Coordinates of C-alpha atoms and ligand atoms in Angstrom, one line a residue:
Chain A
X1 CA 9.3 -7.3 18.4
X2 CA 9.6 -7.8 14.8
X3 CA 8.5 -5.8 11.8
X4 CA 7.0 -8.1 8.9
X5 CA 4.8 -7.4 5.8
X6 CA 1.4 -8.5 6.9
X7 CA -2.0 -8.6 5.2
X8 CA -5.4 -8.9 6.8
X9 CA -7.1 -12.0 7.5
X10 CA -8.7 -13.2 4.4
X11 CA -11.6 -15.1 5.8
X12 CA -14.5 -12.6 5.4
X13 CA -13.5 -11.9 1.5
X14 CA -12.8 -15.7 0.6
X15 CA -16.5 -16.4 1.3
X16 CA -17.7 -13.5 -1.0
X17 CA -15.3 -15.1 -4.1
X18 CA -17.2 -16.4 -6.8
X19 CA -16.3 -17.8 -10.2
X20 CA -18.2 -16.2 -13.4
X21 CA -18.4 -17.4 -16.9
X22 CA -20.0 -15.4 -19.8
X23 CA -19.6 -17.5 -23.1
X24 CA -16.0 -18.9 -23.3
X25 CA -14.7 -16.0 -20.5
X26 CA -14.3 -17.2 -16.8
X27 CA -12.9 -15.0 -14.1
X28 CA -13.3 -13.8 -10.5
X29 CA -16.1 -12.1 -9.0
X30 CA -17.2 -10.8 -5.9
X31 CA -20.7 -11.5 -4.2
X32 CA -21.9 -8.9 -1.8
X33 CA -25.9 -9.2 -0.5
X34 CA -27.8 -10.2 -3.9
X35 CA -25.5 -8.7 -6.5
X36 CA -21.9 -10.2 -8.0
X37 CA -19.5 -7.7 -9.2
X38 CA -16.8 -8.6 -11.7
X39 CA -14.8 -6.7 -14.5
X40 CA -16.8 -6.2 -17.6
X41 CA -14.3 -7.1 -20.0
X42 CA -16.0 -10.8 -19.0
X43 CA -18.0 -10.4 -22.2
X44 CA -15.4 -10.0 -24.4
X45 CA -13.6 -13.2 -26.3
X46 CA -9.9 -13.3 -25.9
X47 CA -9.0 -14.1 -29.6
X48 CA -9.9 -10.3 -30.3
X49 CA -7.5 -9.3 -27.7
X50 CA -4.7 -9.6 -30.5
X51 CA -5.1 -7.5 -33.4
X52 CA -8.4 -4.8 -34.5
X65 CA -25.2 -15.7 -20.9
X66 CA -24.1 -16.2 -17.4
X67 CA -22.9 -18.9 -15.1
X68 CA -22.1 -18.1 -11.2
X69 CA -20.9 -20.8 -9.3
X70 CA -20.3 -20.4 -5.6
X71 CA -17.7 -23.3 -5.7
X72 CA -20.6 -25.8 -6.3
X73 CA -23.8 -24.0 -5.8
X74 CA -25.4 -22.4 -9.2
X75 CA -27.2 -18.8 -8.9
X76 CA -29.3 -17.5 -11.7
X77 CA -28.6 -14.4 -12.9
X78 CA -31.8 -12.5 -13.1
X79 CA -30.4 -9.7 -15.0
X80 CA -27.4 -7.2 -15.3
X81 CA -26.0 -3.9 -16.1
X82 CA -23.0 -1.5 -16.7
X83 CA -21.7 0.6 -13.8
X84 CA -18.6 2.1 -15.7
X85 CA -16.1 -0.6 -16.0
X86 CA -17.7 -3.2 -14.1
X87 CA -21.0 -5.6 -14.4
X88 CA -23.3 -5.8 -11.7
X89 CA -25.1 -9.3 -12.1
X90 CA -28.3 -9.4 -9.8
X91 CA -29.0 -12.6 -8.5
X92 CA -31.8 -14.3 -6.9
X93 CA -30.0 -15.7 -3.7
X94 CA -28.3 -13.5 -1.1
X95 CA -25.3 -14.2 0.0
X96 CA -25.6 -14.9 4.1
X97 CA -21.9 -14.7 4.2
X98 CA -21.8 -10.9 3.5
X99 CA -20.0 -8.7 6.0
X100 CA -20.2 -5.3 7.2
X101 CA -18.8 -4.0 4.2
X102 CA -18.6 -0.2 2.4
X103 CA -16.7 0.7 -1.0
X104 CA -14.2 3.4 -0.2
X105 CA -11.6 4.9 -2.7
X106 CA -7.9 4.6 -2.1
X107 CA -5.5 7.6 -2.8
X108 CA -2.0 6.8 -4.0
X109 CA 0.5 5.9 -0.8
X110 CA -2.3 4.3 0.8
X111 CA -2.1 0.0 1.0
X112 CA -4.2 -2.7 1.2
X113 CA -4.5 -6.8 0.7
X114 CA -4.9 -8.5 -2.3
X115 CA -6.4 -12.1 -2.5
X116 CA -5.5 -13.5 -5.6
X117 CA -7.8 -16.4 -7.1
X118 CA -8.1 -18.4 -10.1
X119 CA -11.6 -19.9 -11.1
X120 CA -13.2 -18.5 -8.0
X121 CA -11.0 -20.3 -5.5
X122 CA -8.5 -18.0 -3.1
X123 CA -4.8 -18.8 -3.7
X124 CA -2.8 -16.4 -2.0
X125 CA -2.8 -13.3 0.1
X126 CA -0.3 -10.3 0.1
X127 CA 0.0 -6.4 1.1
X128 CA 0.7 -3.7 -1.7
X129 CA 0.4 0.1 -2.3
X130 CA -1.1 2.2 -4.5
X131 CA 1.6 3.8 -6.3
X132 CA 1.8 7.5 -6.9
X133 CA 1.4 6.9 -10.9
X134 CA -1.7 4.8 -9.7
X135 CA -0.7 1.3 -10.6
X136 CA 0.2 -1.5 -8.3
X137 CA 3.1 -3.9 -8.2
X138 CA 1.0 -7.2 -7.9
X139 CA 1.6 -10.8 -8.2
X140 CA -1.2 -11.8 -11.0
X141 CA -1.6 -14.4 -13.4
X142 CA -4.0 -15.0 -16.1
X143 CA -7.2 -16.0 -14.5
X144 CA -6.8 -13.6 -11.7
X145 CA -8.9 -10.7 -13.0
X146 CA -11.8 -10.0 -10.6
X147 CA -9.4 -10.5 -7.4
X148 CA -10.2 -7.7 -4.7
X149 CA -8.1 -5.5 -2.4
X150 CA -9.4 -4.5 0.6
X151 CA -8.5 -3.3 4.6
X152 CA -10.5 -4.4 7.6
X153 CA -11.5 -2.5 10.7
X154 CA -12.1 -5.4 13.1
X155 CA -15.0 -6.4 11.5
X156 CA -16.0 -4.3 8.6
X157 CA -14.7 -5.0 5.3
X158 CA -13.5 -1.8 2.9
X159 CA -13.5 -3.0 -0.5
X160 CA -11.2 -0.6 -2.8
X161 CA -9.9 -2.5 -5.7
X162 CA -10.8 -5.0 -8.2
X163 CA -8.2 -6.3 -10.7
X164 CA -8.6 -5.6 -14.5
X165 CA -5.4 -6.2 -16.4
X166 CA -1.5 -5.9 -16.8
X167 CA 0.2 -3.0 -18.4
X168 CA 3.2 -3.7 -20.7
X169 CA 5.6 -2.8 -17.9
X170 CA 4.7 -5.6 -15.8
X171 CA 2.6 -3.3 -13.1
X172 CA -1.2 -3.8 -12.7
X173 CA -4.2 -1.6 -13.1
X174 CA -8.0 -1.7 -12.0
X175 CA -11.0 0.0 -10.4
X176 CA -12.7 1.1 -7.1
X177 CA -15.9 -1.1 -6.5
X178 CA -18.1 1.3 -8.4
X179 CA -16.3 0.6 -11.9
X180 CA -14.0 3.6 -12.1
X181 CA -10.4 3.0 -13.0
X182 CA -7.7 4.4 -10.5
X183 CA -5.5 6.0 -13.1
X184 CA -5.6 7.4 -16.8
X185 CA -6.4 3.8 -17.7
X186 CA -9.0 1.5 -19.7
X187 CA -10.0 -2.0 -19.8
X188 CA -8.2 -2.5 -23.1
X189 CA -4.8 -3.9 -24.4
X190 CA -2.9 -1.0 -25.5
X191 CA 0.7 0.5 -24.5
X192 CA -0.8 2.6 -22.1
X193 CA 2.4 4.3 -20.6
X194 CA 1.7 5.2 -17.1
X195 CA 3.8 7.7 -15.3
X196 CA 7.0 7.2 -13.7
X197 CA 5.9 6.2 -10.1
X198 CA 7.8 8.1 -7.5
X199 CA 8.7 6.8 -4.1
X200 CA 6.4 7.3 -1.3
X201 CA 8.4 9.3 0.8
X202 CA 5.8 9.6 4.2
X203 CA 6.1 5.7 4.0
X204 CA 9.8 5.7 3.9
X205 CA 9.7 7.8 6.6
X206 CA 7.0 5.5 8.8
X207 CA 9.3 2.7 8.3
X208 CA 12.2 4.2 9.8
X209 CA 10.0 4.8 12.5
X210 CA 9.4 0.9 12.5
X211 CA 13.1 0.5 12.4
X212 CA 13.5 2.5 15.6
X213 CA 11.3 1.0 17.7
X214 CA 12.7 -2.5 16.7
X215 CA 16.1 -2.3 16.9
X216 CA 18.0 -0.4 14.1
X217 CA 19.3 3.2 15.0
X218 CA 22.7 3.7 13.1
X219 CA 20.9 5.9 10.4
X220 CA 20.0 8.5 13.1
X221 CA 22.5 11.2 12.6
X222 CA 19.7 13.8 12.8
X223 CA 21.8 17.0 11.5
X224 CA 18.4 18.9 12.0
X225 CA 17.5 20.3 8.5
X226 CA 14.5 22.5 7.3
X227 CA 11.4 21.2 5.5
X228 CA 12.2 22.8 2.1
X229 CA 16.0 21.9 2.0
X230 CA 14.8 18.3 2.8
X231 CA 12.4 18.5 -0.3
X232 CA 14.9 20.2 -2.6
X233 CA 17.1 16.9 -2.0
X234 CA 14.1 14.5 -1.9
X235 CA 12.8 15.3 -5.5
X236 CA 16.1 15.2 -7.6
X237 CA 16.1 11.7 -6.3
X238 CA 12.5 10.8 -7.5
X239 CA 11.1 11.1 -3.9
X240 CA 7.4 12.7 -3.8
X241 CA 7.5 16.4 -2.1
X242 CA 6.2 16.3 1.9
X243 CA 3.1 18.4 2.8
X244 CA 2.1 19.7 6.1
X245 CA -0.5 16.7 6.0
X246 CA 2.4 14.3 6.0
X247 CA 3.8 15.7 8.8
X248 CA 0.5 15.5 11.0
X249 CA 0.1 11.9 10.4
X250 CA 3.6 11.1 11.3
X251 CA 2.5 12.4 14.7
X252 CA 2.1 9.1 16.7
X253 CA 5.1 7.6 15.7
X254 CA 7.0 10.6 16.1
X255 CA 5.4 10.7 20.0
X256 CA 6.4 7.3 20.6
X257 CA 10.0 7.0 19.5
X258 CA 10.8 10.6 20.7
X259 CA 12.5 11.6 17.2
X260 CA 10.7 14.8 15.7
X261 CA 9.6 14.3 11.8
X262 CA 12.4 17.1 10.8
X263 CA 15.5 14.7 12.4
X264 CA 14.3 11.4 10.5
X265 CA 13.9 13.6 7.4
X266 CA 17.3 14.9 7.8
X267 CA 18.8 11.4 8.8
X268 CA 17.2 9.9 5.5
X269 CA 18.5 12.8 3.7
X270 CA 21.9 11.6 4.3
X271 CA 20.7 8.1 3.4
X272 CA 19.5 9.3 -0.1
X273 CA 22.8 11.2 -0.4
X274 CA 25.3 9.1 1.3
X275 CA 23.7 6.0 0.7
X276 CA 22.8 2.8 2.5
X277 CA 26.5 1.0 1.7
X278 CA 25.1 -2.2 1.9
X279 CA 24.0 -1.7 5.6
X280 CA 20.8 -3.2 6.8
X281 CA 17.5 -1.9 8.2
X282 CA 14.8 -4.2 9.0
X283 CA 16.2 -6.9 6.9
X284 CA 16.6 -4.8 3.8
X285 CA 19.3 -2.6 1.9
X286 CA 16.7 -0.3 0.2
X287 CA 14.3 2.0 1.6
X288 CA 10.9 0.6 1.9
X289 CA 8.1 2.9 1.0
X290 CA 5.3 0.7 1.2
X291 CA 4.2 0.8 4.8
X292 CA 1.7 3.7 5.7
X293 CA 2.2 5.0 9.3
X294 CA -1.1 3.6 10.0
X295 CA 0.8 0.4 9.3
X296 CA 3.3 0.7 11.7
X297 CA 1.0 1.7 14.5
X298 CA -1.2 -1.5 13.9
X299 CA 1.9 -3.7 13.9
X300 CA 4.2 -1.9 16.3
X301 CA 1.8 -1.0 19.5
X302 CA -1.6 -2.8 18.6
Chain B
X1 CA 3.6 -11.4 -13.8
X2 CA 4.8 -9.9 -10.5
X3 CA 6.8 -11.8 -7.5
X4 CA 5.1 -10.7 -3.9
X5 CA 6.1 -12.6 -0.6
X6 CA 2.6 -14.1 -0.5
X7 CA 1.0 -16.2 2.4
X8 CA -2.2 -18.6 2.4
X9 CA -5.2 -17.7 2.8
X10 CA -6.2 -17.7 6.4
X11 CA -9.8 -18.7 6.4
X12 CA -9.8 -22.3 7.6
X13 CA -7.3 -21.3 10.4
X14 CA -9.3 -18.1 11.7
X15 CA -12.1 -20.6 12.8
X16 CA -10.1 -23.0 14.8
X17 CA -8.8 -19.7 16.8
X18 CA -9.8 -19.5 20.5
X19 CA -8.7 -17.8 23.7
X20 CA -7.7 -19.7 26.2
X21 CA -7.5 -18.2 30.0
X22 CA -5.9 -19.8 33.2
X23 CA -6.0 -18.1 36.1
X24 CA -4.8 -14.5 35.4
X25 CA -3.3 -15.8 32.0
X26 CA -5.0 -15.5 28.9
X27 CA -3.6 -16.4 25.5
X28 CA -4.4 -18.0 21.8
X29 CA -5.3 -21.6 21.1
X30 CA -6.1 -24.0 18.4
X31 CA -9.4 -25.9 18.1
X32 CA -9.2 -29.0 16.0
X33 CA -12.1 -31.9 16.4
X34 CA -12.7 -32.0 20.5
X35 CA -9.4 -30.8 21.5
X36 CA -8.0 -27.2 21.9
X37 CA -4.2 -26.9 21.9
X38 CA -2.3 -24.0 23.5
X39 CA 1.2 -23.4 25.0
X40 CA 1.6 -25.2 28.4
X41 CA 3.3 -21.8 30.0
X42 CA -0.7 -20.9 30.0
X43 CA -0.6 -22.3 33.9
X44 CA 2.3 -20.0 34.9
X45 CA 1.8 -16.4 36.2
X46 CA 3.7 -13.6 34.8
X47 CA 4.9 -12.0 37.9
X48 CA 7.3 -15.0 38.4
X49 CA 8.8 -14.7 35.0
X50 CA 11.3 -11.8 36.8
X51 CA 13.6 -13.5 39.2
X52 CA 13.5 -16.9 40.9
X65 CA -9.6 -23.2 36.2
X66 CA -9.9 -22.7 32.5
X67 CA -12.2 -20.6 30.4
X68 CA -12.2 -21.4 26.7
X69 CA -14.1 -18.9 24.7
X70 CA -14.8 -19.0 20.8
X71 CA -15.6 -15.4 20.2
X72 CA -18.6 -15.8 22.6
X73 CA -19.1 -19.5 22.9
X74 CA -18.0 -20.9 26.0
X75 CA -16.8 -24.7 26.2
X76 CA -16.4 -26.5 29.3
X77 CA -13.0 -28.5 29.5
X78 CA -13.6 -31.5 30.6
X79 CA -10.0 -32.4 31.5
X80 CA -6.6 -31.8 30.1
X81 CA -3.0 -33.5 29.9
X82 CA 0.2 -32.5 29.0
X83 CA 2.4 -33.4 25.5
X84 CA 5.7 -32.0 26.0
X85 CA 5.3 -28.6 25.8
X86 CA 1.8 -28.3 25.2
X87 CA -1.8 -28.7 26.8
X88 CA -4.5 -30.3 25.4
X89 CA -7.6 -29.2 26.8
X90 CA -10.2 -31.9 26.0
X91 CA -14.0 -30.2 25.5
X92 CA -17.5 -31.3 25.3
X93 CA -18.5 -29.7 22.1
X94 CA -16.5 -30.5 18.7
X95 CA -15.7 -27.8 16.4
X96 CA -17.6 -27.8 13.2
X97 CA -15.3 -25.7 11.4
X98 CA -12.5 -28.6 11.6
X99 CA -11.0 -28.6 8.2
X100 CA -8.9 -31.4 6.8
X101 CA -5.5 -31.3 8.9
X102 CA -2.4 -33.2 9.8
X103 CA 0.6 -32.1 12.0
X104 CA 3.8 -31.9 10.3
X105 CA 7.4 -31.0 11.2
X106 CA 9.2 -28.6 9.5
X107 CA 12.9 -28.8 8.3
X108 CA 15.1 -25.6 8.5
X109 CA 14.7 -23.9 5.0
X110 CA 11.1 -24.6 4.5
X111 CA 8.2 -22.0 4.9
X112 CA 5.0 -21.3 6.1
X113 CA 2.3 -18.6 7.2
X114 CA 1.8 -17.3 10.7
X115 CA -1.8 -15.7 11.9
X116 CA -1.0 -13.7 14.7
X117 CA -3.9 -13.3 17.2
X118 CA -4.6 -11.3 20.2
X119 CA -7.1 -12.6 23.0
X120 CA -8.2 -15.1 20.0
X121 CA -9.2 -12.9 17.2
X122 CA -7.2 -13.0 13.9
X123 CA -5.0 -9.7 13.1
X124 CA -2.7 -10.6 10.5
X125 CA -1.2 -13.1 8.1
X126 CA 2.4 -13.3 6.9
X127 CA 5.0 -15.8 5.3
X128 CA 8.5 -16.6 7.1
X129 CA 10.9 -19.3 7.1
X130 CA 12.2 -21.6 9.8
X131 CA 15.8 -20.5 10.0
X132 CA 18.9 -22.9 10.0
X133 CA 19.6 -21.8 13.7
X134 CA 15.7 -23.1 14.0
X135 CA 14.3 -19.8 15.0
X136 CA 11.7 -17.6 12.9
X137 CA 11.9 -13.8 12.0
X138 CA 8.3 -13.1 13.0
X139 CA 6.2 -10.2 14.2
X140 CA 4.7 -10.9 17.6
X141 CA 3.6 -8.8 20.4
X142 CA 2.9 -9.8 23.9
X143 CA -0.5 -11.6 23.6
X144 CA 0.4 -13.4 20.3
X145 CA 1.7 -16.8 22.2
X146 CA -0.7 -19.6 20.9
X147 CA -0.3 -18.4 17.0
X148 CA 0.0 -20.9 14.9
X149 CA 2.1 -21.7 11.2
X150 CA 0.9 -23.9 8.6
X151 CA 0.7 -24.6 4.7
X152 CA -2.1 -25.2 3.0
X153 CA -2.9 -27.9 0.1
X154 CA -5.9 -26.4 -1.8
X155 CA -8.3 -27.7 1.2
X156 CA -6.0 -29.5 3.4
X157 CA -4.1 -27.6 6.3
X158 CA -0.8 -28.9 7.4
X159 CA -0.4 -27.2 10.9
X160 CA 3.4 -27.1 11.8
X161 CA 4.0 -24.2 14.3
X162 CA 2.9 -22.8 17.7
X163 CA 4.4 -19.9 19.2
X164 CA 5.8 -19.6 22.4
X165 CA 8.2 -17.0 23.2
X166 CA 10.6 -14.2 22.0
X167 CA 14.4 -14.6 22.7
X168 CA 16.7 -12.0 23.9
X169 CA 17.9 -11.2 20.2
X170 CA 14.3 -10.4 19.0
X171 CA 13.8 -13.6 17.1
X172 CA 11.3 -16.1 18.0
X173 CA 11.0 -19.7 19.2
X174 CA 8.1 -22.4 19.4
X175 CA 7.0 -26.0 18.6
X176 CA 5.2 -28.5 16.4
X177 CA 1.8 -29.2 17.0
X178 CA 2.7 -32.1 19.0
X179 CA 4.5 -30.1 21.9
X180 CA 8.4 -30.5 20.9
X181 CA 10.6 -27.6 20.6
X182 CA 11.8 -26.9 17.0
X183 CA 15.5 -25.8 18.4
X184 CA 17.5 -26.3 21.4
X185 CA 15.1 -24.3 23.3
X186 CA 12.8 -24.3 26.1
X187 CA 9.5 -22.5 27.4
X188 CA 11.3 -20.5 30.0
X189 CA 12.8 -16.8 30.3
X190 CA 16.6 -17.3 29.8
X191 CA 19.6 -15.8 27.7
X192 CA 19.1 -18.9 25.1
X193 CA 21.7 -17.7 22.5
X194 CA 20.5 -19.7 19.5
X195 CA 23.5 -20.4 16.8
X196 CA 24.1 -17.8 14.2
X197 CA 21.3 -18.5 11.1
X198 CA 23.2 -19.4 8.2
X199 CA 21.6 -17.8 5.1
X200 CA 19.5 -20.6 3.1
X201 CA 21.3 -21.0 -0.1
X202 CA 18.8 -23.3 -2.0
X203 CA 16.2 -20.5 -1.6
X204 CA 18.1 -17.7 -2.6
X205 CA 19.0 -19.6 -5.9
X206 CA 15.2 -20.2 -6.2
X207 CA 14.7 -16.5 -5.8
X208 CA 17.1 -15.8 -8.4
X209 CA 15.1 -18.1 -10.7
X210 CA 11.8 -16.1 -9.8
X211 CA 13.5 -12.9 -11.4
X212 CA 14.6 -14.6 -14.2
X213 CA 11.1 -15.3 -14.8
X214 CA 10.1 -12.0 -14.1
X215 CA 12.4 -9.9 -15.8
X216 CA 15.8 -9.3 -14.2
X217 CA 18.7 -11.1 -15.7
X218 CA 21.5 -8.6 -15.3
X219 CA 23.0 -10.9 -12.8
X220 CA 23.2 -13.8 -15.3
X221 CA 26.9 -13.9 -16.1
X222 CA 27.3 -17.5 -15.3
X223 CA 31.0 -18.0 -15.3
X224 CA 30.7 -22.1 -15.4
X225 CA 31.8 -23.0 -12.1
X226 CA 32.0 -26.5 -10.3
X227 CA 29.9 -27.3 -7.4
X228 CA 32.4 -27.5 -4.8
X229 CA 34.3 -24.2 -5.7
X230 CA 31.3 -22.7 -5.1
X231 CA 30.6 -24.0 -1.8
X232 CA 34.2 -23.0 -0.7
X233 CA 33.3 -19.1 -1.2
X234 CA 29.4 -19.6 -0.2
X235 CA 30.8 -20.9 3.6
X236 CA 33.7 -18.0 4.0
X237 CA 30.1 -15.8 3.3
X238 CA 27.7 -17.6 6.0
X239 CA 25.9 -19.5 3.2
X240 CA 25.1 -23.1 4.3
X241 CA 26.7 -25.7 1.8
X242 CA 24.6 -27.0 -0.9
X243 CA 24.2 -30.8 -1.2
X244 CA 22.7 -33.0 -3.9
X245 CA 19.1 -33.0 -2.7
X246 CA 18.9 -29.3 -2.9
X247 CA 20.0 -29.4 -6.4
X248 CA 17.5 -31.8 -7.4
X249 CA 14.5 -29.9 -6.0
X250 CA 15.8 -27.0 -8.1
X251 CA 14.9 -29.2 -11.2
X252 CA 11.5 -27.7 -12.2
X253 CA 12.8 -24.0 -12.1
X254 CA 16.1 -25.1 -14.2
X255 CA 13.7 -26.8 -16.7
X256 CA 11.4 -23.7 -17.1
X257 CA 14.1 -20.8 -17.6
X258 CA 16.6 -23.0 -19.4
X259 CA 19.4 -22.3 -17.0
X260 CA 21.2 -25.0 -15.4
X261 CA 21.5 -25.2 -11.6
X262 CA 25.7 -24.6 -11.8
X263 CA 25.5 -21.3 -13.9
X264 CA 23.1 -19.7 -11.3
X265 CA 25.2 -20.9 -8.4
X266 CA 28.2 -19.3 -10.4
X267 CA 26.1 -15.9 -11.2
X268 CA 25.5 -15.9 -7.5
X269 CA 29.2 -16.2 -6.8
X270 CA 29.9 -13.3 -8.6
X271 CA 27.1 -11.9 -6.5
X272 CA 28.8 -12.6 -3.2
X273 CA 32.2 -11.4 -4.3
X274 CA 31.6 -8.5 -6.6
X275 CA 28.1 -7.3 -4.8
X276 CA 24.6 -6.1 -5.4
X277 CA 26.1 -2.3 -5.9
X278 CA 22.9 -0.9 -5.4
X279 CA 21.4 -3.0 -8.2
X280 CA 17.7 -4.2 -8.0
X281 CA 16.8 -7.6 -8.2
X282 CA 12.9 -7.8 -7.6
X283 CA 12.6 -4.8 -5.9
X284 CA 15.7 -5.5 -3.4
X285 CA 19.5 -4.8 -3.1
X286 CA 19.9 -7.7 -1.4
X287 CA 19.6 -11.6 -1.3
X288 CA 16.5 -12.9 -0.2
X289 CA 16.4 -16.3 1.2
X290 CA 13.1 -16.9 2.7
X291 CA 11.0 -18.1 -0.6
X292 CA 11.5 -22.3 -1.2
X293 CA 11.6 -23.5 -4.9
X294 CA 7.9 -24.7 -4.4
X295 CA 7.0 -21.2 -3.4
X296 CA 8.4 -20.1 -7.2
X297 CA 6.5 -22.6 -8.8
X298 CA 3.5 -22.1 -6.9
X299 CA 3.4 -18.4 -7.8
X300 CA 5.1 -18.2 -11.1
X301 CA 3.1 -21.1 -13.0
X302 CA 0.2 -22.2 -10.9
Ligands
UWO1 C1 -6.8 -9.8 -15.8 C2 -6.8 -11.4 -16.4 O1 -6.1 -12.4 -15.8 N1 -6.7 -11.5 -17.7 C3 -7.1 -10.2 -18.6 C4 -6.3 -9.3 -19.0 C5 -6.7 -8.3 -19.6 C6 -7.9 -8.0 -20.7 C7 -8.4 -7.1 -21.5 O2 -7.5 -6.1 -21.6 O3 -9.3 -7.3 -22.0 C8 -9.9 -6.4 -23.0 C9 -8.9 -9.5 -20.3 C10 -8.6 -10.5 -19.2 N2 -9.1 -11.2 -19.0 C11 -9.3 -12.6 -18.7 C12 -8.3 -13.4 -18.5 C13 -8.0 -14.9 -18.4 O4 -7.3 -15.5 -18.4 C14 -9.5 -15.7 -18.5 C15 -10.5 -14.8 -18.8 C16 -10.5 -13.3 -18.5 C17 -6.6 -12.7 -18.5 C18 -6.0 -12.5 -19.9 C19 -6.5 -12.7 -21.1 C20 -6.1 -12.6 -22.3 C21 -4.6 -12.3 -22.4 C22 -4.0 -12.0 -23.7 F1 -4.6 -12.8 -24.7 F2 -4.5 -10.6 -24.1 F3 -2.5 -11.7 -23.5 C23 -3.7 -12.0 -21.2 C24 -4.6 -12.0 -19.8
UWO2 C1 4.5 -15.2 23.8 C2 3.9 -14.4 24.6 O1 2.8 -13.4 24.0 N1 4.0 -14.2 26.1 C3 5.1 -14.9 26.6 C4 6.2 -14.9 26.4 C5 7.2 -15.7 27.0 C6 6.6 -16.7 28.2 C7 7.6 -17.1 29.0 O2 8.8 -17.4 28.8 O3 6.7 -18.3 30.1 C8 7.7 -18.7 31.1 C9 5.1 -16.6 28.3 C10 4.4 -15.8 27.7 N2 3.2 -15.8 27.8 C11 2.1 -15.0 27.5 C12 2.4 -13.4 27.5 C13 1.4 -12.7 27.7 O4 1.4 -11.1 27.2 C14 0.0 -13.0 28.0 C15 -0.4 -14.3 28.6 C16 0.7 -15.2 28.1 C17 3.5 -12.9 26.7 C18 4.5 -12.2 27.7 C19 4.1 -12.5 28.8 C20 5.2 -12.1 30.0 C21 6.5 -11.4 29.6 C22 7.3 -11.0 30.4 F1 7.0 -10.4 31.4 F2 8.0 -12.1 30.8 F3 8.4 -10.1 29.9 C23 6.5 -11.2 28.1 C24 5.7 -11.8 27.1

């Protein structure tokens, strides 16, 4: 029992982390096979971010860059020694709504790990300080590591922005300091529904009134509260949770609809008095049934 | 910027994790130097938890137990090979209010990491499934690992209970299945005050009214809302946060006092509409100022 916001173990990424310096500028990079990835704005100097040559250390072991190139927004420093601590990996691209773990690092040493979601506006609500550029976000499948995120920058609203491991940015964003107003993030509705399932499994059922409602009547309400519309694909993926708790998707929709319109009222669901949207349905299955 | 509930990297603990089987019964254990720790109720059989010989595998490497002994509530399996992946460690005991990271494991393999607090009633609000007994909770200081918790059991109220690494249980609890009604956990007031600081640092200041109030007048209110009394030692440790934000401890006390009595009212502080008590003041300093 218990539900808790839970990151994957960080051991296999920690030993792929490295410190990268170019001129005065030093940040974090990822070491896989014989190539080190890192954000390309490492070649800028920071004085020039106010108005209009490589060192690679793996803790204490110096690698020689023997050349580099630029794929989109990331630099691919080719090194001579090949990392023996390279796990099974693959470079996946994430869609809004999916979640991952972030291992925040400074000067190449890991400091923390935490779980967060790729918001519908393509930003992520991270915890980043200066020096964190180059930290990676990832999922793991027992022993295969799916890298899906590298940090680049902090937008003016406090939120964060970065790329996939091939260099392409997640949203309409660029590796430069500007007022890049990202869209309003909507609340991830499939995830809120999944968290409500995790509540049921674990104790809380007061919100379960479930006046049966249809799909689109819910969507009508959902949208004038800034909830992303629910599609058939979202319904499908709740299948397993539906199966376990014996509460059809339309019911949980309906019960949430009285939450949006009649409110939490200070009442508590799984340690919270607001509707959590940063757990995917697979999250709930991994945590609530192995 | 950003505040996010953040566990220490789990790499150094992951390689001290091992699977332990005794008769039919198999769970998780910790391997340090040449001794493996694990809960002593490994020698029970589970059929007998309803009404009134060692295998140690490190993934695939079998260790020979050459003997064992019982310190309090944990078994110390002495093995012949000594773990080369043993970090700097020390066995600390935690007091209620302090926080740690839990690396949940099944059949000796790590599955997740997460952050939680030792509640004032000596229970912890974990995320544990059958098979998780023997998982450890710990803090790290850059390279020294302070082990402070090993999981034993789940109380009837869903909460969890365990020991320090020397075998002694945290509260008035025992390694047996009974209705052990633990006390009401009070809300950790020093921590709520620290989270309010992290809010200020990061954006949110609406709760800052700060009608100056005294210490004990606050305590009067605090207690009839089930908030643990605030001592001089708690005031002291908020010193640094006080220094950074330029808002004296009595002010934040006072502002929280109007939160307890005039309510959140759906309003949001750092992604939440209830008062979070599971961040220590050192947590805020580590996350908000390196
Ligand atoms: C992500 C990060 O830690 N930093 C960062 C942020 C933005 C950009 C950018 O837009 O470049 C065009 C670059 C960086 N790079 C680095 C840092 C560092 O602190 C270390 C060196 C890499 C920080 C950073 C740097 C400068 C600033 C400033 F001055 F613009 F405000 C902020 C963060
Ligand atoms: C912590 C844990 O995972 N388990 C557990 C819980 C309590 C006790 C206990 O009170 O013993 C006197 C022992 C255990 N031990 C083990 C398990 C396992 O699933 C694997 C073997 C170790 C579980 C567990 C076992 C049995 C039950 C039961 F039947 F009592 F409900 C519950 C959890």
